[PDB]
A paper describes a structure:
In order to visually understand the evolution of the AncTxs, the crystallographic structure of AncTx1 (variant W28R-I38S) was solved. As it might have been expected, the structure was rigid, except at the tips of the three loops. AncTx1W28R-I38S represents well AncTx1 as the two mutations on loop 2 do not perturb the structure, as can be verified by comparing AncTx1W28R-I38S with MT2. Loop 1 is more susceptible to backbone variations, and both MT7 and MT2 are subjected to a large kink at the tip of this loop. The selectivity of AncTx1 is characterized by a slightly higher affinity for α1A and a much lower one for the α1B and α2C receptors, relative to ρ-Da1a. Having recognized that the substitution (I38S) in AncTx3 affects α1D binding and that (W28R) increases α1B and α2C binding, the appropriate substitutions were integrated stepwise in AncTx1 to boost its selectivity. The pKi values for the AncTx1 double variant W28R-I38S were calculated to be 8.59, 6.41, 3.71 and 4.85 toward α1A, α1B, α1D and α2C respectively showing that despite an impressive loss in α1D affinity (3.71 vs. 6.58 for AncTx1), the selectivity of this variant suffered from a large pKi gain toward α1B (6.41 vs. 4.75 for AncTx1 I38S). We increased the affinity of AncTx1 for the α1B, α1D or α2C receptors with just two variants, unfortunately without achieving our primary goal to improve selectivity. Epistasis, a phenomenon already stated as important in protein evolution may have been the cause as revealed by other ancestral resurrection studies. Indeed, the functional effects of a substitution could depend on its surrounding context or sequence background.
In addition, mamba venoms contain aminergic toxins that recognize various bioaminergic receptors. Aminergic toxins belong to the three-finger fold toxin (3FT) superfamily, a structural fold known to support a large diversity of biological functions. Despite sequence identities that vary from 70 to 98%, aminergic toxins display highly variable pharmacological profiles. Here, we use the ancestral protein resurrection methodology on the aminergic toxin group in order to pinpoint the functional substitutions which may have occurred during their evolution and use them for molecular engineering.
Author numbering: 1 to 65
Amino acid sequence: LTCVKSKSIFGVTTEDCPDGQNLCFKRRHYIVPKMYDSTRGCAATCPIAENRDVIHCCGTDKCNE
């Protein structure tokens, strides 16, 4: 599995996930309403949506882009 690790106006980083990490995630952490910072990566289990988080997990290559 490959997951996007960074995606910006400057470039994109893709990671081949290590053994045991067969999910990609994209986490949107909201600072104020309708404004948020996005983090992405591989994961073994879908990360917990903590305070102010919306988290999407998926299982195909670069599905979190």
